[PDB]
Amino acid sequence: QTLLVVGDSISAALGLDTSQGWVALLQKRLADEGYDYRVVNASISGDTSAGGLARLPALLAEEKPALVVIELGGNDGLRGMAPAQLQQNLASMAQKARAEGAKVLLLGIQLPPNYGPRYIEAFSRVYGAVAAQEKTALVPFFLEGVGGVQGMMQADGIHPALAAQPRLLENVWPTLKPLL
């Protein structure tokens, strides 16, 4: 009955009190609404689709999760890495999680507008592709109402501020709920 979150800086709550981070809020909402889940946050700043893929098997073996939330690839895009390798790595992660017995939920991220639609979309479309291929659930716009917004982003315009954490949780819950 474990919900494993495998993310980067966004889910690790970079730049804020982790107890106020979206995953922390997830655990509190599960508790409040009388759901019986252990939330294991395995998010690490700096992580990439390749890094998450490399470290997932150990996590699956150790926790044997019923649900795996994957929030990776934001770094692949921010670094200008290849969109195709993102699709491969995420697909393989979703395959391996499903192989362990877990339902998979992908969190998709859109880079800031200044990257331009073609770049933004090149990575953004990958999430939908992986969900299609591996039959996963998907939140295509995890940063809806957060990205690009003033107050919601920290100054570097990538890492959500404290005020955004509720909204991050709002963005996942609806798509997560039916999986519980």
Author numbering: 1 to 180
Would you copy out the relevant sentences from the publication that reported this structure?
Furthermore, GDSL-hydrolases are characterised by a three-layered α/β/α-fold with a conserved core structure consisting of five β-strands and at least four α-helices. The GDSL enzymes have catalytic residues, namely Ser, Gly, Asn and His, located in consensus sequences designated as blocks I, II, III, and V, respectively. In the present work, we show that TesA shows lysophospholipase A (lysoPL A) activity with substrate specificity for medium and long chain lysophospholipids (lysoPLs), which are predominantly present in the bacterial cell membranes.
The crystal structure of TesA has been determined at 1.9 Å resolution. There are two molecules per asymmetric unit which are related by a two-fold noncrystallographic symmetry (NCS) (the root-mean-square difference (rmsd) between NCS related molecules A and B is 0.38 Å or Q=0.984; note: for identical structures Q=1). The monomer atomic model comprises residues 1-180 of the protein (light blue), no electron density was observed for the C-terminal His-tag comprised of residues 181-186. The compact single domain structure is comprised of a central five-stranded β-sheet surrounded by five α-helices and three 310 helices. The structure of TesA confirmed these residues as active site residues located on the top of the solvent exposed substrate binding cleft. Both the positioning and the orientation of the catalytic triad residues at structurally conserved topological sites classify TesA as a typical GDSL hydrolase. Interestingly, the conformation of the respective loop in the apo (i.e. ligand-free) form of the TesA structure is similar to that in the complex of TAP with the substrate OCA, but not to the TAP apo state. Interestingly, a comparative B-factor analysis of TesA and TAP revealed significantly lower values for TesA. The more compact structure and the lower B-factor values clearly indicate pronounced conformational rigidity of TesA. The structural alignment shows the presence of both waters in TesA, in identical spatial positions and with the protein environment comprised primarily of highly conserved residues. Superposition of TesA and TAP revealed a structural diversity in the thioester binding site, where TesA shows significantly lower thioesterase activity.
